Design a protein around this ligand. Structure first.
Ligand SMILES: Nc1ncnc2c1ncn2[C@@H]1O[C@H](COP(=O)(O)OP(=O)(O)OP(=O)(O)O)[C@@H](O)[C@H]1O
Ligand SMILES: [Mg+2]
Ligand SMILES: [Mg+2]
Ligand SMILES: [Zn+2]
Lengths: 1735, 205
RNA sequence: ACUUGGUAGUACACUACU
RNA sequence: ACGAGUGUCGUACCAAG
């Protein structure tokens, strides 16, 4: 109701106002106070301001366009000379910034492992291997630094002949589960754990081995370090450009390939083969051969041994005393590891210290990836020892999971490439998969951009190499990979010319064939061979996804990020003086151009919708309560500013920094800084804490800061109530070489930014259902569309401009004049600018957004004032330095030379830095995107003016994401050459970005001819392209370790996503096999392990167990891609249906087969089938057994899983929550929790919702605190800790399985183990009864209810494979008419809200479709007897106990709602864009293409169906009124008449049509019925030939047909072959009253025309010509050839009107000549004759 | 959807469901496979192939034509153009039959004499009887139809419905693995898929 | 510096865009 | 030694003799 008077006096506003010219200040102040609801017109302000700035905008556009004649054609080309100069500059810069070492022994281990082949002669017994190792260690011959220590270690592990005694002692120890037991010179503490015997080793040797060799205690503690002990030096790296270093790296690679390419002497037999070999071999035999060859090599054995040895090292790193050591072994009887004492591995930031030992018969037969310490002679061969290696949990996890990554990489790089050698690929892949250091990340991350920009037409790669590229080469493989990248960059440009376009087959409606030719001419990058363009791009983009996530150390990365932010802020403070400029100064904005462009764009956008404000309010719940918005009630983290001494405070110590030490604290000990010393040492320290969003909302509601008013009013009040904004930051932890800063703010800042972001979002052209962080694959289709359009523009235009030239040249082909003509024809040009902006959010001019708020016509003056006040306050925000960074900087003891952090914080007087111009990461995505689109509109205008200066044709398209930009330009001109145009276009693109305060990134921006690259998506000249491998590799490296089924489901979803992006079937099967194998490895479920379920369920093999019960996925690859994770149940049901259906109904639709289920008997069913059917009936369609305790759970907290392991419940995270204390207070009350349960029981809708007002929201939060899984979502689940959880504690009970409907402690503790869970599940399932009616319910509500499942089942049943075809025209396609396959229209949350509130019209749904959704849900509830069973159970329990149990009824209600939610969610199948070999026009076409594309890798087949797969049903027959059946009849007859005219002989067309009409049916409706509908309608004038041939035509039909002459009646007596390319006979007839014209011509020569009239006078001729040719006839008349004229004749002439609109008239010869000749005398619009007219 | 239309050995109703034969381009229909045409044959005792083709149209169709585009990334477009008087759907079907039947008969020679040779007849009997016992897999009906078509063209449609099944399942493996494979024909992949599937299924059985 | 004993569950970790 | 790094860190911690 009121605005903000404070905005006018704000310092930020005063600075913004005084920086503008006086008229601009007047315009801004008049625009803020403009009221579009009280002015004469809504656009009065925008039009006035647009007119005021029009002259400057026009001058800028014209001046930029006139630069096209000043271009020289010399753009930035990435040729070899420029790359060499950039590389030289890079080498100088890196030599300056790092310490370069040319010596070899400074190399770090490329792989932290050494390996040797196993000995077939020796035994694989642990004790025998231990004895052999002990004998080999003692018999070391020679003298070295640690030889005596190694021999002593061998001595103190000998057992002599007491192997039996050792085994019995170990068994006795392990049976009951310390005092070492003297066996023989060995102090054995456990199996393979020994105690350091002081009598067998010298003290000096022991100190040397444990301090110098292992680093155990060699250092001095932090409290004792002094000034002379701190290390100051630059990071030391190897000379990557040195010749000797490169030769050494090449020698290492050659030796690795020589040793690791041998054969294992075994037979490949593992889980992957035995489970998926049939499918892999069927999809592609070459993939099976490749993986079988991989399994036979030393690479596979080496990496598997390393993974197993790392697992065995981790499993014994828990209880290690300071004077002991351990021996770890693997399946290789020659490779051992010594594990040295360290901290407990499961503690905070703990490491593991190990040393690998290999016994090998011959020297030089050792795999040494730069890790060897020494090879010494011993009895019977040699013993190799590696250096001590210290690793942390993430690096150990990467090592353990490496084999899957190695297999995936090897199979991806070799797919369909006979020119590549498997050994080179395996060598590269083993070196890139076992790398756990930042050395190769620093190369993989920039290699993408470097090679892509070197391959480009034009790019700024030279300056990127010279200034930003910085290899970090600490290992020899880093040097090798640097050389590989250098060679690739050198060869990219001079092999660019080897890419060729495919022949384009276009048909006026679609492009059948397109893309890049697949010829193996390009040179392979990472290993010798030849690749195609697609394989080249895959090699460029694939290694970026090998990299490990989270290799950054907080200690250094926090300082790095703080330094980056503070450097940007200081540079802006001390060097950015002007806000507005006109010469494209960096970090400045052209004021008038910005204002004019914003006005023009706002006028265009707001004119398209008359209810934009209502769309903003309704789409974002502006008038609803704050508790109904998801982003305001989430479990995400927000910031709190206050006094948190008690919460954060968790003997005295003094700081290490001398600048913060009191004179009375010197006589103390130095210690690591914590909250207390930081608080004491900082005067102006502001206190803060991080809480959860929902908890912050609870606290704000409790303290009456937020009320029950609509959220928009609260936001508007908060915009003026909250004036000081505070932010903190943390490191994202991404796989790049440098981390990204992420900013966390307060709740009030969240509300204020939410309002502005939602206002700016509705104008953006982005999809509202997707996120900025996750761009949908729909863009993959959009790109294609654009390209197709542009291709058409390139084909029609050039041809149109070169028709005359081609005709003349051809007549002269059957010479100097020939080339003279050929150089005068218009040439075409294609350009693709793929750009990213540099520092999108950091180096941006925030002030421009001010105008975006002032010029908005959909806001009131008060709203504008409040929003602008919020923005002024936001420009005053303060970033809080994290306490950890302050700890880091307060224990240094040495002043940094040029400390930016100390300077910007006043020598650490405070912890806050003022950040003005940097709007933080992701806060203003939509506003910035809108301004970016305005900039692209300005650039497009400049290009259009420039091209029309050349009298050419142009088509500019621009896709704009947050900062990613893709601009495609198609140009057709005969004036200047193409390089000048390219140079001009790039210069103007850079200048257009600089005009709006943006800046093109020199690292990711490049220019191509035929390669579109939007966000991770490619368009290779009309053909969509995606690097599907990044979905496979990410499925291996990324794992949350939540549980077996959860990990398996996530990996299957990744495989499905890869399939949707064009993954060949064999590789998808390999990915699924690897996912299953890794999930079974992690949770000990392989055949013969602890948790193997095969012998606990009625299943012969793992194919017969549902994947929810740790089985494997048995489903065709067609079902997985289209449904996913519900394909197992569908395939099992289909197999049952085929098995038990009579042979007379075997080849019918799935519906007809299901109708025969009632004739089955339960007695003749296999026990496995009964088991799985019971699971489907009671665990999927019901909630008979709870995976965990459900009290406090909501309707959406029950997945598809059955056995869910428990996770961490961090008490430290929970106690920070304000609402958790309230919950604990209520729990410790006499009758509080029971009253809360009663309140929830009286209002059950709070189980689906979570409170739509203040009181219900608070009660629901307190109730949800009982969930025991909601508490696990608020806690910390470290993937490394959960990784070691499955290794250290494998037999611990973790599963909270609780039967059938209620029948010192570790942080993770369940009730039963996995095997006990299996046993209980079988005991409980057998107690249930399955009946034929139960099977009917299963089939009716898993298959029959969903049209999509019916379609999929029918495709599996009715498919008939056809002819093999070749992939040439891959295209993006969604499912056509998929809205007919949606059983339930709305989202499950909305449907459950409507069901609970019993209200079809809820605050977010359409009341019409929600009624049908509700009736579907009610039918499901009624037919499955869910509510009746719930009532019976409740009544039985109450009668048994005597009094009503609130807990039991609440649990039953929760189960009911969870079952309903799961059923509604199982209906929605998110079938997004698919990449298919051809174009899909129907649902049958889509299904057939998808099915035929997924059976072989080499070719795709044609699939037909015996019957209709999309049988009419409840969503297909229904939802179709009279007009729908009318359209069905129209389509049927339009199809049948032309089918008869095209494929049926002339003498048999009438009989064929009669048979079609009387006997067949179309879309389940009889053809006779359709013919009766069209005869009894008003549209029978559209089927005159049909009525005439049958005989149902009347004179009334003819009168109706010839009575429509009033609107000039246009008919085409014949169809043109191509109306866009102007091919085919033109036979057109236009008729009105007393006038008619008929035109005949072929291609572009109108042969003649006849004009029949009633008054032969020139006036009537001209008026009739204007009235006829001005109709909607579709003939162009300007693409026709110009003809000569003769006196006395009349001609159809065309003339230009709107530079794209034309006028067609009929003129006389003298008229044309006179007007043209007087028009020459003074652009140049002359009357052009086309055709002759006979009057 | 409706009952089949029997005009000679052709089935016009099943022509309606053959989407790859509904091209209006003479070159596309002429250069198809026998697999695309096999779906149209339901002779049921026909000794000739040129009777039902009289029910196909005789109007001129389109044919492809190519043309270079004057652009920096050079490429050639191929479009449709109104064909001559002899480019008819019936003529394209006739040419398809003439080429593809010969190609298939060369691919299933199995003899030093020819396709009709009695040893080849016994081999084809064994091939058809394999699918008579083993449940029809996805890559069998296509071959059955092509064999039937080529027997009709070779004048022994009689010796296709007279096929008598001769079972020891181990014998099949040998007889099949020793069966040679084609290289040039579209059956360079089809017949090998058939052999692989049949041997795998008999191993499972 | 050395010997013995005792203690230790996670990076207490995490944003915007649905 | 190993991890990190042109930011001083990790390289277990505590008590006793
Ligand atoms: N993980 C993220 N969290 C939050 N916002 C993000 C995230 N990633 C991207 N954004 C948003 O998208 C914008 C684009 O970021 P992008 O990754 O393209 O780099 P940039 O910050 O523009 O810098 P540069 O290209 O110079 O590395 C960011 O400025 C930010 O607003
Ligand atoms: Mg960017
Ligand atoms: Mg970007
Ligand atoms: Zn026959």
């Amino acid at each position: 109701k009121t605005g903000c008077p404070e905005f006018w006096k704000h310092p930020i506003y005063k600075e913004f106002k005084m920086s503008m010219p006086v008229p601009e200040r007047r315009l801004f102040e008049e625009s803020v106070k403009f009221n579009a609801y009280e002015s004469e017109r809504w656009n009065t302000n925008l039009v006035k301001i647009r007119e005021y700035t029009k002259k400057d905008y026009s001058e800028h556009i014209s001046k930029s366009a006139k630069n096209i004649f000043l271009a020289s054609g010399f753009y930035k080309q990435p040729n070899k000379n420029e790359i060499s100069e950039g590389w030289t500059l890079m080498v100088e810069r890196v030599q300056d910034q790092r310490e370069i070492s040319k010596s070899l022994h400074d190399q770090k281990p490329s792989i932290h492992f050494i390996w040797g082949a196993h000995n077939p002669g020796n035994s694989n017994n642990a004790t025998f291997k231990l004895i052999l190792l002990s004998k080999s260690l003692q018999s070391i011959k020679g003298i070295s630094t640690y030889t005596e220590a190694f021999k002593s270690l061998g001595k103190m592990m000998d057992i002599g002949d007491k192997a039996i005694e050792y085994e019995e002692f170990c068994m006795s120890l392990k049976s009951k589960a310390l005092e070492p037991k003297q066996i023989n010179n060995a102090l054995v503490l456990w199996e393979q754990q020994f105690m350091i015997n002081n009598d067998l080793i010298d003290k000096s040797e022991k100190l040397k081995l444990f301090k110098n060799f292992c680093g155990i205690g060699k250092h001095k503690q932090f409290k004792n370090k002094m000034l002379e002990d701190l290390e100051v030096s630059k990071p030391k790296i190897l000379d990557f450009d040195d010749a000797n270093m490169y030769l050494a790296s090449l020698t290492m690679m050659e030796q690795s390939k020589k040793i690791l390419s041998k054969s294992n002497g075994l037979k490949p037999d593992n889980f992957i083969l035995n489970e998926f070999g049939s499918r892999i071999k069927d999809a592609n035999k070459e993939t099976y051969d490749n993986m079988h060859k991989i399994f036979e090599t030393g690479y596979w054995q080496c990496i598997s041994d390393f993974s197993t040895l790392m697992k065995n090292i981790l499993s014994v790193s828990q209880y290690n005393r300071h004077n002991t050591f351990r021996i770890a072994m693997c399946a290789n009887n020659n490779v051992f590891a010594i594990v040295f004492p360290s901290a407990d591995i499961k503690t905070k930031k703990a490491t593991v210290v190990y040393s690998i030992i290999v016994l090998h018969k011959e020297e030089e037969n050792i795999f040494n990836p730069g890790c060897l310490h020494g090879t010494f002679k011993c009895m019977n061969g040699y013993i190799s020892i590696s250096r001590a290696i210290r690793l942390d949990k993430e690096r150990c996890q990467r090592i353990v999971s490496s084999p899957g990554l190695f297999l995936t990489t090897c199979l991806l790089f070799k797919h369909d490439n006979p020119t590549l050698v498997m050994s080179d690929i395996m060598n590269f892949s083993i070196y890139t998969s076992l790398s756990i250091t930042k050395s190769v990340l620093s190369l993989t991350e920039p290699a993408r951009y470097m090679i892509m920009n070197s391959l480009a037409i034009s790019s700024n790669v030279k300056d990127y190499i010279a200034e930003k590229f910085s290899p970090y080469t600490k290992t020899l493989f880093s040097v090798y990979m640097t050389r590989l990248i250098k060679n690739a960059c050198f060869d990219a440009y001079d092999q660019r010319q080897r890419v060729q376009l495919r022949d384009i087959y276009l048909s006026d409606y679609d492009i059948t064939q397109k893309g890049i030719k697949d010829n193996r001419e390009l040179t392979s990058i990472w290993f010798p061979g030849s690749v195609t363009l697609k394989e080249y791009l895959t090699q460029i983009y694939l290694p970026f996804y090998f990299n490990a996530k989270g290799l950054h150390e907080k200690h250094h990365v926090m300082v790095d990020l703080a330094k980056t932010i503070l450097e940007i802020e200081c540079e802006q403070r001390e060097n950015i003086k002007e806000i507005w400029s006109t010469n494209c100064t960096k970090q400045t904005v052209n004021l008038k151009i910005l204002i004019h462009s914003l006005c023009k764009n706002l006028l265009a956008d707001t004119s398209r919708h008359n209810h934009l404000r209502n769309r903003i309010e309704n789409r974002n719940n502006f008038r609803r309560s704050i508790t109904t918005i998801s982003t305001f009630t989430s479990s995400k983290s927000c910031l709190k500013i206050g006094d948190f001494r008690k919460e954060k405070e968790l003997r005295k110590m003094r700081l290490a920094n001398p600048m913060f030490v009191t004179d009375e604290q010197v006589c103390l000990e130095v210690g690591h800084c914590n909250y207390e010393m930081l608080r004491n040492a900082m005067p102006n320290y502001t206190d803060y804490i991080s809480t959860k969003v929902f908890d912050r909302l609870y606290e704000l509601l409790d303290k009456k800061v937020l009320t029950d008013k609509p959220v928009i009013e609260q936001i508007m009040d908060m915009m003026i109530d909250h004036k000081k904004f505070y932010f903190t930051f943390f490191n994202k932890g991404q796989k790049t070489s440098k981390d990204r800063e992420i900013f966390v703010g307060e709740y009030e800042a969240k509300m204020c930014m939410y309002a502005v972001e939602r206002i700016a979002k509705e104008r953006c052209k982005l999809n509202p259902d997707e996120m900025i962080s996750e761009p949908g694959d729909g863009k993959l289709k959009v790109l294609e569309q654009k390209s197709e359009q542009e291709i058409r523009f390139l084909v029609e235009t050039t041809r149109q401009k070169n028709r005359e030239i081609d005709e003349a040249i051809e007549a002269l082909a059957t010479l100097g004049k020939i080339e003279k003509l050929s150089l005068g024809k218009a040439k075409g040009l294609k350009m693709e600018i793929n750009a990213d902006m540099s520092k999108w959010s950091a180096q941006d001019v925030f002030y421009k957004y001010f105008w975006l708020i002032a010029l908005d016509p959909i806001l009131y003056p008060q709203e504008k004032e409040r929003i602008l006040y919020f923005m002024c306050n936001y420009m005053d925000k303060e970033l809080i330095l994290p306490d950890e960074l302050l700890f880091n900087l307060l224990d240094q003891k040495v002043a940094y030379q040029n400390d930016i952090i100390a300077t910007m914080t006043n020598q650490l007087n405070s912890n806050t830095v003022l950040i003005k111009r940097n709007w933080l990461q992701g806060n203003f995505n939509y506003t910035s995107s809108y301004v970016h689109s305005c900039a692209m509109s300005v650039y497009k205008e400049i290009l259009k003016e420039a091209i029309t200066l050349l009298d050419g044709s142009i088509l500019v398209n621009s896709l704009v994401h947050s900062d990613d930009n893709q601009t495609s330009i198609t140009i057709v001109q005969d004036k200047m050459e193409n390089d000048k145009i390219i140079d001009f276009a790039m210069k103007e693109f850079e200048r257009a970005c600089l005009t709006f305060g943006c800046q093109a990134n020199m690292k990711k921006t490049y220019v191509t001819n035929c390669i579109k690259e939007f966000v991770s998506l490619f368009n290779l000249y009309g053909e969509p392209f995606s690097i599907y491998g990044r979905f496979l590799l990410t499925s291996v490296g990324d794992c949350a370790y939540i549980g077996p089924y959860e990990d398996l489901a996530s990996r299957i979803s990744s495989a499905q996503t890869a399939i949707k992006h064009g993954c060949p079937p064999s590789l998808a099967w390999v990915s699924i096999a690897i996912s299953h194998w890794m999930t079974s490895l992690t949770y000990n479920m392989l055949p013969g392990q602890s948790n193997d379920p095969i012998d606990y369920f009625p299943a012969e093999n793992r194919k017969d167990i549902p994947i929810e019960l740790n089985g494997v996925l048995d489903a065709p690859l067609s079902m997985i891609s289209t449904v996913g994770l519900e394909s197992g149940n569908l395939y099992f049901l289909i197999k049952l249906l085929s098995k038990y259906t009579p042979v007379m109904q075997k080849r019918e639709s799935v519906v007809n087969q299901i109708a025969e289920v009632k004739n089955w008997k339960v007695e003749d069913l296999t026990d496995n089938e009964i088991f799985r059917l019971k699971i489907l009936r009671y665990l999927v369609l019901d909630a008979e057994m709870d995976p965990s305790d459900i009290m406090g759970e909501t309707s959406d907290m029950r997945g598809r899983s059955i056995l869910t392991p428990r996770k961490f419940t961090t008490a430290g995270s929970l106690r920070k929550l304000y609402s958790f204390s309230k919950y604990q207070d209520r729990l410790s009350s006499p009758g509080g929790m029971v009253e809360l349960f009663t309140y929830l029981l009286e209002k059950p809708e709070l189980l689906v919702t979570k409170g739509e007002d203040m009181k219900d929201y608070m009660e629901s939060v307190i109730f949800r605190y009982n969930s025991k899984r909601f508490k696990e979502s608020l806690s910390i689940q470290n993937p490394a800790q959960l990784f070691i959880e499955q290794i250290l504690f494998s037999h611990k009970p973790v599963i909270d399985f609780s039967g059938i409907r209620d029948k010192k402690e570790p942080d993770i503790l369940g009730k039963v183990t996995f095997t006990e869970a299996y046993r209980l599940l079988m005991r409980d399932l057998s107690s249930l009864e399955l009946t034929n009616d139960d099977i009917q319910v299963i089939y009716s509500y898993i298959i029959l209810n969903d049209p999509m499942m019916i379609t999929i089942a029918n495709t599996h049943i009715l498919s008939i494979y056809g002819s093999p075809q070749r992939r040439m025209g891959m295209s993006c396609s969604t499912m056509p008419e998929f809205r007919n396959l949606k059983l339930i229209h709305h989202s499950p949350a909305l449907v459950l809200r409507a069901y609970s509130k019993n209200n079809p019209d809820i605050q977010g749904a359409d009341p019409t479709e929600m009624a049908r959704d509700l009736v579907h849900l009610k039918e499901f509830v009624e037919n499955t007897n869910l509510e009746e069973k719930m009532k019976v159970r409740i009544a039985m329990n109450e009668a048994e106990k005597g009094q009503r149990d609130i807990v039991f009824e609440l649990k039953e209600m929760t189960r009911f709602y969870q079952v309903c939610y799961e059923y509604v969610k199982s209906t929605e199948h998110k079938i997004k864009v698919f990449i298919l070999p051809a174009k899909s026009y129907t649902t049958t076409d889509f299904c057939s293409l998808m099915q035929g594309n997924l059976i072989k890798d080499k070719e795709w087949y044609t699939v037909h169906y015996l019957k209709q797969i999309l049988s009419g049903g409840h969503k297909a027959i229904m939802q179709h009124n009279a007009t729908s059946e009318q359209n069905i009849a129209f389509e049927c007859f339009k199809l049948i008449t032309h089918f008869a005219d095209s494929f049926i002989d002339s003498l048999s067309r009438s009989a064929f049509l009669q048979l079609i009409i009387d006997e067949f049916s179309y879309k389940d409706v009889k053809v006779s019925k359709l013919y009766d509908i069209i005869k009894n309608g008003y549209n029978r004038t559209d089927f005159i030939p049909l009525l005439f041939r049958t005989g149902d035509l009347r004179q009334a039909d003819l009168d109706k047909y010839d009575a429509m002459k009033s609107h000039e009646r246009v008919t085409w007596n014949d169809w043109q072959t191509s109306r866009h390319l102007d091919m085919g006979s033109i036979n057109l007839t236009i008729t009105g009253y007393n006038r008619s014209i008929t035109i005949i011509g072929e291609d572009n020569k109108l042969t003649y025309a006849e004009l029949c009239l009633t008054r032969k006078t020139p006036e009537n001729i001209t008026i009739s010509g204007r009235k006829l040719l001005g109709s909607r006839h579709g003939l162009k008349f300007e693409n026709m050839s110009k003809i000569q004229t003769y006196p006395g004749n009349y001609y159809i002439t065309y003339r230009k009107k709107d530079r794209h609109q034309f006028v067609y008239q009929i003129h006389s010869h003298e008229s044309i000549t006179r007007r043209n000749e007087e028009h020459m005398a003074i652009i140049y619009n002359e009357i052009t004759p086309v055709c002759v007219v006979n009057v | 959807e409706g009952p089949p239309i029997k005009t000679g050995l052709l089935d016009l109703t099943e022509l309606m469901k053959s989407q790859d034969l509904l091209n209006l381009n003479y070159d596309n229909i002429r250069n198809s496979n026998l697999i695309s045409f096999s779906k149209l044959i339901c002779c049921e005792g026909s000794d000739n192939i040129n009777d039902g083709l009289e029910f196909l149209s005789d109007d001129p169709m389109n044919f492809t034509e190519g043309e270079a585009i004057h652009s920096t990334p050079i490429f050639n477009i191929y479009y449709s153009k109104r064909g001559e008087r002899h480019m008819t759907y019936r003529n394209a079907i006739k040419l398809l039959i003439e080429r593809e039947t010969k190609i298939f008969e060369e691919a299933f020679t199995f003899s030093e004499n020819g396709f009709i040779s009695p040893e080849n007849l016994g081999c084809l009997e064994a091939v058809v009887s394999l699918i008579k016992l083993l449940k029809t897999n996805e890559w069998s009906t296509v071959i059955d139809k092509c064999i039937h078509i080529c027997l009709i063209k070779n004048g022994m449609d009689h010796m296709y419905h007279s096929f008598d099944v001769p079972i020891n399942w181990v014998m099949f493996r040998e007889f099949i693995n020793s069966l040679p494979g084609t290289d040039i024909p579209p059956w360079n992949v089809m017949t090998e898929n058939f052999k692989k599937k049949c041997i795998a299924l008999i191993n499972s059985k």
